Subunit: 322 residues, 6 copies
Amino acid sequence: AMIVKEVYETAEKIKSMEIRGAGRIARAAAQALMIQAEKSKAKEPEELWNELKVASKILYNTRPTAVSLPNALRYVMHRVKAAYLGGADLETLRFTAINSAKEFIYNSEKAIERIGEIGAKRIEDGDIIMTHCHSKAAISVMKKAFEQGKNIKVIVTETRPKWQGKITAKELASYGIPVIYIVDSAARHYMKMTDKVVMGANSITANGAVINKIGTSLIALTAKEHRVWVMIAAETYKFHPATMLGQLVEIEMRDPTEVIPEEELRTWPKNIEVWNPAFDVTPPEYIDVIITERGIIPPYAAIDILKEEFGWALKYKEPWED
Amino acid sequence: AMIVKEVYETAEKIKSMEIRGAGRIARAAAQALMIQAEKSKAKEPEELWNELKVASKILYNTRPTAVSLPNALRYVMHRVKAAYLGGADLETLRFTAINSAKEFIYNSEKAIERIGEIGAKRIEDGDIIMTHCHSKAAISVMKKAFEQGKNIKVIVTETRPKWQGKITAKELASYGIPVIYIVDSAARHYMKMTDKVVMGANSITANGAVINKIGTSLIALTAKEHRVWVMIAAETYKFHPATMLGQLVEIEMRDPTEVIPEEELRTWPKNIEVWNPAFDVTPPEYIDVIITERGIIPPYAAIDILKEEFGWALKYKEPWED
Amino acid sequence: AMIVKEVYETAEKIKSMEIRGAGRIARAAAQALMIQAEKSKAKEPEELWNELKVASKILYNTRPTAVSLPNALRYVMHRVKAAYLGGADLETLRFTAINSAKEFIYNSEKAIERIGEIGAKRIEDGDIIMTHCHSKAAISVMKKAFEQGKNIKVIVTETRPKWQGKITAKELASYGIPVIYIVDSAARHYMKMTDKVVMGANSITANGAVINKIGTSLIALTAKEHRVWVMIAAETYKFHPATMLGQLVEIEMRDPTEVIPEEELRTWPKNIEVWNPAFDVTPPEYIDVIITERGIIPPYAAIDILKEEFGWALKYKEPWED
Amino acid sequence: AMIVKEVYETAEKIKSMEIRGAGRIARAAAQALMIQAEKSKAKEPEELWNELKVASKILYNTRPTAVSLPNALRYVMHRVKAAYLGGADLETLRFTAINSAKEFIYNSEKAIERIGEIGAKRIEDGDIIMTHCHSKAAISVMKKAFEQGKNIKVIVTETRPKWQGKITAKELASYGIPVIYIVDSAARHYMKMTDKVVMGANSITANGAVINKIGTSLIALTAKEHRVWVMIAAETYKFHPATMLGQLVEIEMRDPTEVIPEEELRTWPKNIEVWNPAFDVTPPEYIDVIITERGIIPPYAAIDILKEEFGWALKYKEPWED
Amino acid sequence: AMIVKEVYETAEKIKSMEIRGAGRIARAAAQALMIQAEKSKAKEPEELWNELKVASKILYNTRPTAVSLPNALRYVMHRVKAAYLGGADLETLRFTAINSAKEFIYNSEKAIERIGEIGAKRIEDGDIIMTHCHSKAAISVMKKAFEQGKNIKVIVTETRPKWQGKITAKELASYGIPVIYIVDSAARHYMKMTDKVVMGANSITANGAVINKIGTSLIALTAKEHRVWVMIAAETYKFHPATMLGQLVEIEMRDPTEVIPEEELRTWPKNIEVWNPAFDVTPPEYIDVIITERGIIPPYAAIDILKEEFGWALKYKEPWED
Amino acid sequence: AMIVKEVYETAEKIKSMEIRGAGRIARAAAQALMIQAEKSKAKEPEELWNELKVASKILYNTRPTAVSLPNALRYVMHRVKAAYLGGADLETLRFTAINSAKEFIYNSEKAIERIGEIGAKRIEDGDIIMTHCHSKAAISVMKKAFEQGKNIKVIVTETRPKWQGKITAKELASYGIPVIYIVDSAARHYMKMTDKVVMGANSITANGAVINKIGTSLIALTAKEHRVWVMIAAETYKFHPATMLGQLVEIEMRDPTEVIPEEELRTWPKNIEVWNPAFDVTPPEYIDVIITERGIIPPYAAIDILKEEFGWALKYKEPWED
Ligand SMILES: Nc1ncnc2c1ncn2[C@@H]1O[C@H](COP(=O)(O)O)[C@@H](O)[C@H]1O
Ligand SMILES: O=P(O)(O)OC[C@H]1O[C@H](OP(=O)(O)O)[C@H](O)[C@@H]1O
Ligand SMILES: O=P(O)(O)OC[C@H]1O[C@H](OP(=O)(O)O)[C@H](O)[C@@H]1O
Ligand SMILES: O=P(O)(O)OC[C@H]1O[C@H](OP(=O)(O)O)[C@H](O)[C@@H]1O
Ligand SMILES: O=P(O)(O)OC[C@H]1O[C@H](OP(=O)(O)O)[C@H](O)[C@@H]1O
Ligand SMILES: O=P(O)(O)OC[C@H]1O[C@H](OP(=O)(O)O)[C@H](O)[C@@H]1O
Ligand SMILES: [K+]
Ligand SMILES: [K+]
Ligand SMILES: [K+]
C-alpha cells in the first residue's frame, strides 16, 4: 500500500511522545486516518480500504498501553469496514473515513469539556487538589472549578521520568490557578493537607482498575489511607473492551535513557538494569469515582460503560483486519 | 571566640550536602570539634571551653532534621563540660575533646558494621530488596548478606530531588550486587516482586516513628500493603531524646532549585510555589523492625533505647550551653 | 399567585420537623400539591399550572438534604407539566395533579411494606439488631422479622440532638419487640454483641454513598470493623438523580438550640460555636446491602437504580420551572 | 407418580456426594429429568407433567446450597410448564423435557470451556496459582493456561474433610501441571509465593458474595491481605436468584462421620459435638473478579447477571409446584 | 470504727459524680483519709489503723472503673501499713497518713501540669483538636498550647449522657480558646477537619488499652481511619496494676435515669431496657501516644510504667486488708 | 564418648513426635541430661562434662523450631559449664547437672499452672473460646477458667496433618468442658460466634512474632478481622534469644507421608510435591496479649523478656560447645 507521510510522521511522534496524553494520541490517529483518506491516490474502493487497514496497523503499533488509540481506529474503521462491505464506491468510502474521523475528534473535545463540567461540581471552594502527570481530562475539571470562582490550589507532582508535571504546573498557573509543585516522593507528606485527588487514565478495565502514569497507584493508595477522594477523569473511550474477555493490559516499558540520559548511562556498569514502566495499575477499591462524559460512576460500573458501548464489537475481529 | 577554618568549612559542607547521610555528618561534626581542640591557640581552659561551645553551636545550626549531628556534639561536649567543671586544666580539657571525638567516630564505624552483621541474618538467599536514598547502615546490611554468598538483587529508587539513589546504585554494583534502578513512582508496581525493604534513618522518635528521606513513608506504606518486611537500619544515635518530652522533629525544607534548576525556575511564573521537604515521617505500624548495633527491636522499643542511653541528659541543658 | 393554607402549613411543619422522616415528608409534599389542586379556584389551566409551580417551589425550599421530597414533587409535576403542555383543560389538569399525587403516596406505602418483607429474610432468629434514628423503612424490616416469629432484640440509639431514638424505642416496644436503649457513644461498645445493623436513608448517591442521620457513618464504620452486616433500607425515591452529573448533596445545618436549649446557650461565651449537621455521609465500602422495593442491591448498584428510573429527566429543567 | 429408578439413583448419589461439584450435580439433575421423560409410560400429558414435578422435587431435596441444581431444574421445568399449559400433547411435552435437559447439559459444558478461555488470559507465564477443593470451572482455567504454553504451578489445598484436593492434584498432574500439595492451614504461609488465587462457586448472591467449599473465605481473606488476585470461575447458573429478594443461602451441614470416621467417633464422650459445614461465605471485598461464560465482572455485578437472566422468574412460583 | 463524716460525704459525692474526673476522685480519696487521720479520736495505733482500713474500704467501694482511686488509697495505705507494722506510735502513724495523703495530692497536681507541658509540644500552631468528656489532663495540654501562643481551636463533643462536654466547652472558652461544640454522633463527620485528638483516661491496662468515657473508642477508631493522631493525656496512677496478672477492668454501669430522666422513664413499657455504661475500651492500635508526667510513650509501653512503679505490690494483699 | 540408652530414646521420640508439645520436649530433654548424669560411669569431671556436651548435641539436633528445647539444654548446661570451669569435682558436677535439670522441670510445671491462673482472668462466663493444636499452656487457661465456674465452650480445630486437635478435644471434654470440633478450614466461618482465641507457642521472636503450629497465623488473621482477642499462652522459655541479633527461626519441614500416607503417595504422579511445614509465623499486630508466668504482656514486650532473661548469654558460645 501507498501510505502518506503524515501517517508515518504521526506514528513516529506518538512513539517518541512528542504527541502524548491518551486522548490526544487517539485524536492524532483519527486525524492521520483522515489525511490518508484525503490524500489517497487510490482508484478502486479496495485500494483505499487496503491503505486504511495498513495505516491503522501502523498506528496501533506505536504505544500499546492506552486503549484510547485503538478505540479511535475502531471508531473509524468499523464504519469504513461496513461501508466497504456494503459495496460502497470510492468517494463514499473516502468520505466515510474522513467523516468518522472528524466525528471522533469532535466527540473527544466535547467529552473532555463535559467531564470538566461534571467533575467541577465535586470541587468545593477552598479545596486543595493533588494531581499526577498531565491529563487534559483532569485539568478540565480543575480549570472549570476555578472558572466557577472557587479558590483552589493545585498540588502537582513532577511525574518522573518524563516530567509531565512541568506541563501541568505551567498550564494551570497560566489560567491563574495557584500551583504547589513537589517531587512524587512527597505525595504522602502532603496528603494530609489535600482535600481531593484528580487524575486521568490511559485504560480502564472491566473490573474498575485504572491504568495511568507510573505513580498513580501510590498516590491513590495514600489518598485512601487518608480518606481523600480519588477521582478519575476519563472519556468513555479510555475503557478497554478486550478486558471484558480476560485480556490483560500491557504495561509499556520505555527507553532507560528517559531515566538516565545516554551520556551518563553509558558510564554505568553492566550489572545495573534501569526499568522504566510508563504506567501502573490502580485497583478499584482505591477509586471513589470515575468521571466520564456520561456522568459519575463508581469504578465497578466500568463494566456497564463497556457492555453498553463496546461489547457488541468483541464477537468480530478488529476492523482493520483480514 | 577564635574558631578554626575547618569548623566553618565543615558547617558549610554539611549545609550544602556535599557531606551528607546522617551518620557521616555526625562524624564530621565530631571531627570538626576534634580539630578545633587540636589547633586551638587558647591558653586558659575557659578560652578553649568557649571555642568548643561556639563551634558546637555553629555545627548544630547546619541541618536540623537528623538528630545524629546533635547527639555527636553532645557525646563530646557532655564529657568536655564535666571535665571543665571538674576544674580540668588546658591540656586535660583539649584531650578530653579530642578523645571523646575519636571515640564517637570509632563507635559510629563499629555500630554500622555490626548493623551489617545483624541485619544480614534477616536477608535470605534469592531475596529481592528494595531500598531508598543512600544509607550506609542499610547498605552495610545488603553488602554483608551478599558477602555471605546469598544471591540478592537490589531495587534502588532514584530518590528525587537530589538523586542519592545514583550513589547507591553505583556503590552496590561496585561490590558485585545486581541492581535494578527505578524512579520513586515505581515503588508500588515493584512491591509485588520485592521480598524485603531496607532503609536508613535520620531520627527516630520515642514512639517508634522514623524520619528519613522524603518518600520513605510511601515505600513503607505499600510495603505494609503487600506484607513485605520493612526493616530500618539505624545506629542508636539516630534516636531522638527530645521527643521523650514531647518535642516534634523539624522537617528540613531545602532550596527549590534542587527541584527546578535556577536557569529554568526563574522563567516560571510567581504563582507556582516549589516545596522541597527533605524528609517525611513513617509511622511505627509500618515498620517490622529497627536494626541497631544492640540488636533487633520492634519500632515501639525505641523508647527503651532512649530511656536507657539518653534520658538522663534531658534534666540538664545542652552541653554547649551557658 | 394564590396558595392554599395547607401548602404553607405543610411547608412550616417540614421546616420545624413536626413532620419528619424522609419518606414521610415526601408523602406530605405530594399531599400538599394534591390539596392545592383539590381546592384551587383557578378557572383556566394556565392559572392552576402556575399555582402548582409555586406550591412546588414553596415545598422544595423547606429542607434540602432528603432527595425524597424533590422526587415526590417531580413525580407529580412531570405528569402535571406534560398534561399542561399537551393541552389539558382545567379539570384534566386538576385530575392529573390529584392522581399523580395519590399514585406517589400509595407507591410509597407499598414500597415500605415490600422493603420490610425483603429485608426481613436477612434477619435470623435470635438476631440482635442495632439501628439508628427513626426510619420507617428500617422499622418495616424489624417489625416484619418479628411477625415471622424470629426472636429478635433491637438496640436503639437515642440519636442526638433531636432524640428520634425515643420514637423508635416506643414504636418497636409497642409491637412486642424487646429494646435496648443506649446513647450514640455506646455503639462500638455494643457492636460486639450485635448481629446486624439496619438503618434508613435520606439520600443515596450515584457512587453508592448513603446520607442519613448524623452518627450513621460512625455506626457503619464500627460495624465494618467488627464484620457486622450494614443494611440500609431505602425506597428508590431516596436515590439522588443530580449526583449522576456531579452534584454534591447539601448537608443540612440546623439550629444550635436543638443541641443547647436557648435558655442555656444565651449564657455561654461568644467564642463557643454550636455546629448541628443533621446528616452525615457513609461511604459504600461500609454498606453490605441496600434493600429497595425492587430488591437487594450492593451499594454500587445505586447508579443502576438512577439510570433506569431518573436519568431521563436530567436533560430537562425541573418540572416546576418556567 | 411412577418415578424411574434413575431419578432415585441420581438423588441418592447427589446426597452421598458420589456425584459432586456444583455444575456436575446440575447436569446430573437435568439428565435425570431427561430420562424420566424418555422412559415415562404416561398416556396423558397431565400424567407426564406430574411425574416431572415429582422428580424435580426429589432432585431438589438432595443438597441445598448449590443453586446450580434448582437452576437446572428450572431451566427444564419452566419450558415443560409453558408447553403443558399451552396445551401440548403427550409427545410434544416429552420432547420439550428431553430437549430442554439436553440444552442445559450442552450449555453447561460450553460455558465451562469458555470460562477456561476467558480466565486463562488472566494467567501469565510463571504464575504460581493457589486453588481450593475441586472445581471444574477453576480447573478449566488452569488447564487452558498451561495449553497456551504458560509455565504454571498450582498449589492445591487438600480440602478437608472430604479431601477433594486429592482429585484436583491428580487431575492437574495428569495434564502436565506441577502441583504443590498442602494442608488447608498452610494457605497463609504460602500466600507470599502465590501470584493468583482461582477457585469455584456453588452459589453467588445478589450482593456479590460467593458461597463455596468450607475454607474458601479464609484463603480469600489472606489473599487480600497479601494483594493476591482472587478470581472466582463460575457459570451464570451459579448465580442465586432468590437472593435478589432477600433470601439467605442455606449452608449444608453434613454428617459428622466425614470428619471423624464412625468407628472412632462412637468412642468419643457425648460432650464433644462435631460440626461440619460444607460451605462458607466469602464477601465481595475479597474477590477481584468473577469469570463467567459471558466475561469478567466485578463481584458487585452479580446483580446484573441476575437481573438480566433470572429476575423475570421471581413473580412466579417454582415451575415444579402445584 | 469511728468514721468521720468527711469520709462518708466524700464517698457519697464520688458515687453521685458531684465529685468526678479520675484524678480528681483520687485526690479526694487521699484527702478524705488525711482528714480521718487529722480528726481521729483514736488512743492506740491499732485503733487509728483500723479506722484507716475501714475508710479506705468505704472509699474503694464508690466507683470501680478508674484505677486512680485504688492507687491513691494504696499510696497512702502502703505507707500507713509499713509504719503500723514497723511499730510506729499513735502520732507517728497519724503523721504518716496525713503526709502520705499530702504527697499524693501534690504529686497529682504537678503531674497534670507536667503532662500539659509535654503534650503542648506536640500541638502546633493552627491545630484543630478534638477532645471528648472533661479531662483535666487533656485540658492542661490544650491550655498550655494556647499559652505558648499557638492559635488552636477545639472541637468538644457533648459527651452524653452526663454532658461533661459542657464543662469542657465553658472551661476552654474561659481561657481564650475557641470551641466548636458538637454531638457525639458528629465526630466522624468532623474528623476530616481535625488535626489532633487529645483525650484522657480512667484506667490504662498492661497491654496498652485505655478505658475512658463512653464513646472514646469510637472517636479513636475514626481518628485512625483518618490518620489523625490520637494522644491520651494520663498520669502514671491511671495505670492499672492488677491487669499485669490478667485482671479485667470492670465497666461501671450507671443508673438508667441519667439517660432518660425518672419522670419520662416511668412512663415507658417494661420491654425497653436502658443500658448506661460509663466507659469503653480503646485498643492500643488506635492510640499514637500516651503523655504521662514522665514523658511520651507508645501505648505498648504501659507495661513498663507498671513494671517499674507498681508491679512490686502484686505479691502482697491490698494494704487496707486484714 | 559414652551415652546412655535414655538419651538416644528421648531423641528418637522427639523426632518421631511420640513426645511433642514445645514445653514437653523441653522437659524431656532436661530429663535426658538428668539421667545421663544419674547413670554415667565417668570417673573424672572432664569425662562427664564431655558426655553432657555430647548428649546435649544429640538432643538439640532433634527438632529445630521450638526454642524451648535449646533453652532447657542451656538452663542445665550454663550451670554445668560454670561448675566445671570453676573446678567442681565429679560428684559436684553430677549434682549440678541433675539439679539444674530438676529445677527446669519444676519451673516448667509451675510456669504452666501460673499461666493458667493469669489467663483465666481474661476468660468470662459464657465465653466461646477457639483454640488450635494441643498446647498445655493454652489448656491450662481453659481448664482453670472452667474450674472457676465460668460456663465456657471450646471450639477445637482438628489441626492437620497430625490431628493434635483430637488430643485437645478428648482432654478438654474429659475435664467436663463442652467442645465443638471443626476442621481448620471452618475457622472463619465460626469466628463470628467466637469470643476469644487461646493458642500456644513454640518460639516467640524479639519483634513479637509467634511461631506456632501451622494454621495459627490464619486463625489469628481472621480473629483480628472480627475483633476477637488473640491470646498466646507461653512460658518465658518459649522466647527466642538469638532473634535478638537477627537470627531467623527455621520452620520445620516434616515428612510428606504425614499428609498423604505412604501407601497412597507412592501411587501419585511424580510432578506432585507434598510440602508439610510444621509451623507458621503470626505477626505481633494480630496478637492481643502474650500470657507468660510473669504476667500479661503486649507482643512487642517480647524483647523485654529476652533482654532481662537471655541477652546476657549471647556474647558467649553455646554452653555445650568446645
Ligand atoms: N522465620 C522467621 N523467624 C523470625 N521471625 C519471622 C520469621 N518469618 C517471619 N517473621 C516475622 O513475622 C512477621 C511475618 O509476617 P508478614 O509481615 O505478614 O510477612 C514479620 O513481622 C517478621 O519479622
Ligand atoms: O487523556 P488525558 O486525560 O490528557 O491523559 C490521560 C493520561 O495519558 C497520559 O499518558 P502518557 O503521557 O501518554 O504516557 C497520562 O498517563 C495521563 O494521565
Ligand atoms: O546514616 P546513613 O544510614 O548513611 O543515612 C541515613 C539517612 O540520611 C540521609 O539523609 P540526607 O541525605 O543527609 O538528607 C538519608 O535520609 C538516609 O536514609
Ligand atoms: O424515610 P424513613 O425510612 O422513615 O427515614 C429515613 C431517614 O430520614 C430521617 O431524617 P429526619 O428525621 O427527617 O431528618 C432519618 O435520617 C431517617 O433515617
Ligand atoms: O483525670 P482527668 O484527666 O480529669 O479525667 C479522666 C477521665 O475520667 C472521667 O471519668 P468520669 O467523668 O469521672 O466518669 C472521664 O472519663 C475522663 O476522660
Ligand atoms: O508447650 P505447649 O503449650 O504444650 O505447646 C506449644 C506448641 O507446641 C506444639 O508443637 P508440636 O506439636 O510439638 O509440633 C504446638 O505448636 C503447640 O501450640
Ligand atoms: K486530607
Ligand atoms: K512481595
Ligand atoms: K466474634
